[PDB]
Amino acid sequence: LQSTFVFEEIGRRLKDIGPEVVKKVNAVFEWHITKGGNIGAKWTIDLKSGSGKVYQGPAKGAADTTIILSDEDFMEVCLGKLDPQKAFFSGRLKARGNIMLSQKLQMILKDYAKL
Numbered sequence: 001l002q003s004t005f006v007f008e009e010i011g012r013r014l015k016d017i018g019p020e021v022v023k024k025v026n027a028v029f030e031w032h033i034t035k036g037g038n039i040g041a042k043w044t045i046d047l048k049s050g051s052g053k054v055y056q057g058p059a060k061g062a063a064d065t066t067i068i069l070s071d072e073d074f075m076e077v078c079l080g081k082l083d084p085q086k087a088f089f090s091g092r093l094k095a096r097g098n099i100m101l102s103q104k105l106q107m108i109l110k111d112y113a114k115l
Contacts, residue, residue: 003043004075015051017112028047043057
């Protein structure tokens with residue numbers, strides 16, 4: 001899966017910026033990465049306490065938001081070739097629970113990525 005390198009890089013960056021992100025975000029994001037429409041990987045980005053954490057599999061507690069999309073579509077979002085809001089409205093990106101939290105996540109992580 002192409003997305004594995006991205007989740008690992010998010011975990012490495014959270015070592016440095018995690019405390020500041022956690023204050024601004026305050027939530028737990030679960031990711032179901034599909035291939036052949038079948039779940040090829042699950043990840044959690046826990047931005048709720050400490051320096052935050054990225055780990056494999058479902059949230060240890062409740063996830064605020066769950067996003068489901070293909071490995072390819074996830075990579076296209078990360079490469080700026082697919083707008084995440086456009087993918088959502090076209091039905092390529094599924095988001096459950098608190099949908100707008102994940103758009104907050106998008107904005108904050110884009111800000112830090114520019115530093």
